[PDB]
Enzyme design. Structure first.
Site, short mmCIF file in Angstrom:
data_model
loop_
_atom_site.label_atom_id
_atom_site.label_comp_id
_atom_site.label_asym_id
_atom_site.label_seq_id
_atom_site.Cartn_x
_atom_site.Cartn_y
_atom_site.Cartn_z
N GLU A 237 0.78 -1.23 0.00
CA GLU A 237 0.00 0.00 0.00
C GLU A 237 0.82 1.29 0.00
OE1 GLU A 237 -3.57 -0.28 2.31
OE2 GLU A 237 -4.03 1.85 2.20
N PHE B 210 -14.63 -4.28 1.61
CA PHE B 210 -14.51 -4.69 2.99
C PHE B 210 -15.80 -5.31 3.52
CE2 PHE B 210 -10.50 -3.06 2.72
CZ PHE B 210 -9.88 -2.65 3.89
#
Ligand SMILES: *[C@@H](CO)[C@@H](O)[C@H](O)[C@H](O)[C@H](O)COP(=O)(O)O
Ligand SMILES: *[C@H](CO)[C@@H](O)[C@H](O)[C@H](O)[C@H](O)COP(=O)(O)O
Ligand SMILES: [Cl-]
Lengths: 320, 317
Positions: free
Chosen positions: A98, A180
């Site tokens: 990330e 998510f």
């Protein structure tokens, strides 16, 4: 008599969600994912103390002219990459790394950070096809990913909490999205101080991924749908058949030790493909604002990853 | 002559009435007045304005026979907004604030369109633009819209301000006035810390937000008017005595009118940086959890009330 984990692997690409590479081998996932919180967790494990210390000394010795601020930034990216390489050593697929969460609202600097990550992997002898650049799915992150994909750099769009958000990612031609589950379930439970997980049919997180999966398959989008963030194995099992699922070592262990039959729940179809207009920036921002949970969790996710990134920088400064 | 706290406040701050009910305004003699989608909705539902609402419904429908149910409803809504604004202008010497449809908050182009439409409706009713402030939610897009509107001579009231970054960007865009919320910020403070009673004035996040913005503006020479809005009690209003302006509910104006103690002025007059970029603005807003939440919810709430107004119009068509 086969474990649920082994059965899951036959209908879904199983991915390990951790920076602790020594735990990955025994689950034999295809890909693996890291994030700023998982990297920080690994950095603080005594078993990786020397890996961190070595990385700090190497970068420091190889960059004597960098000012202290730039030195810390270089060390942070090398640590991220070092864990990624240790992960690639034990899997056959890709690893997600990330970008600095602080560039989440700047497409240009997101692109810069993404290319820097790729450069470090390449300098360490890793081909770029083994890496996914993880970017928060704000409008700016999606815009950055669109450019990166045009230049052959595969991205993993994360912190996805809304369908319109997932649609914009697919429209940008991103390689993979990470809607998510767990954090949505958290919101749902916290809204009414719920002490037990909701029934799967009523789990907002599980339903979010189901809706995104249905959208993608009905619109012929090729972007990979990878469910992420889980609170229990039933959530993972309820999504069997999803393109991919990234799962914590704790839950992978549970899946490995259960030998019940696994029924596929998500499936592709040969229905007529729906062609729809593109989501504009204004429409994306409006739809996100209407989704109270999504606006909150995206903003919070960026804040929390930033806190962990700053903590890592402080660790670096305290050991420089 | 002994004067009430309200009367003393008027000498050091521009007192503004926060209401859509013009019949309550003249009593307090404020300089300006402010409305919003929630206040307009409450006024539209009152029986005394049931005759006013009905006439607007018929007036619009007669002049627009071919417009569909969608456009008809929206046209009635904008004329209703302006009608209340005009009735307010009859009882004050200053300006009235009228807010654009909250649904255009993330679209600068359609915000500009709506703002111009409001101004056009006032003009057709014999009210020039100088008596009007266009209320716009202080999202990045709203600020960009206001920047262009100000260049066209249309004064704007940037609302739902919860962070110094918004205020800075608003001032840099040359906006006429900003409305930092006080009460909603304190609401957050009390929920987060599970507070039972209100915080001390010195520790009140809402009051301190206006104080900080006021200080920022005067130290940097920004001419944008600072108008505190949204109050929970009179102590919060009194704490900001000396602010450029304060918009206050009729309930709190009544309380101020009946207070007779001496009023101490707290804000008084006594640097230039590069303008904030879109990326820096968005980052700073995200770091302020309260601001991101209250701006987003404020837009959602005004939207709900705008939709309710449309529902009242449809069933009364
Ligand atoms: C990247 C997504 O592919 C992955 O590392 C995600 O960042 C994590 O799955 C989530 O952050 C996990 O969040 P949780 O709240 O710990 O469940
Ligand atoms: C416009 C600001 O100049 C004004 O009408 C504001 O909309 C109101 O002051 C607030 O919305 C009131 O909020 P509260 O939470 O009701 O106190
Ligand atoms: Cl929020």
């Amino acid at each position: 008599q086969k474990s649920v984990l082994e059965q899951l692997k036959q209908v879904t690409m199983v991915v390990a969600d951790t920076g602790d590479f020594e735990l990955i081998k025994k689950y034999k996932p295809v890909d693996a994912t890291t994030n700023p919180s998982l990297i920080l967790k690994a950095v603080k494990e005594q078993k990786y103390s020397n890996l961190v210390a070595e990385t700090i000394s190497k970068v420091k010795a190889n960059n004597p002219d960098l000012n202290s601020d730039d030195l810390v930034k270089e060390i942070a990216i090398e640590i991220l990459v070092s864990f990624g390489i240790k992960i690639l050593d034990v899997i056959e697929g890709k690893v997600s790394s990330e970008v600095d969460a602080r560039v989440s609202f700047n497409s240009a600097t997101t692109i810069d950070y993404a290319k820097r990550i790729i450069a470090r992997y390449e300098s360490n002898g890793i081909p770029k096809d083994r890496v996914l650049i993880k970017i928060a799915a704000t409008w700016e992150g999606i815009k950055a990913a669109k450019l990166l994909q045009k230049e052959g750099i595969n991205c993993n769009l994360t912190l996805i909490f809304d369908k319109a958000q997932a649609k914009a990612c697919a429209e940008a031609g991103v390689y993979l999205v990470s809607p998510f589950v767990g954090r949505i379930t958290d919101w749902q439970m916290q809204q009414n101080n719920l002490k037990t997980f909701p029934a799967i049919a009523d789990d907002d997180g599980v339903n979010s991924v189901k809706a995104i999966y249905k959208l993608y398959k009905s619109h012929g989008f090729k972007t990979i749908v990878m469910g992420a963030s889980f609170r229990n194995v039933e959530q993972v099992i309820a999504l069997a058949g999803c393109d991919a699922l990234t799962i914590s070592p704790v839950l992978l262990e549970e899946l490995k030790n259960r030998d019940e039959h696994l029924e596929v729940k998500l499936t592709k179809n040969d229905d007529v493909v729906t062609q729809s207009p593109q989501i504009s920036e204004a429409d994306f921002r409006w739809l996100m604002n209407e989704n109270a949970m999504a606006t909150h969790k995206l903003a919070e996710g960026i804040r929390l990853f930033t806190k962990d990134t700053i903590e890592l920088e402080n660790i670096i400064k305290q050991n420089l």
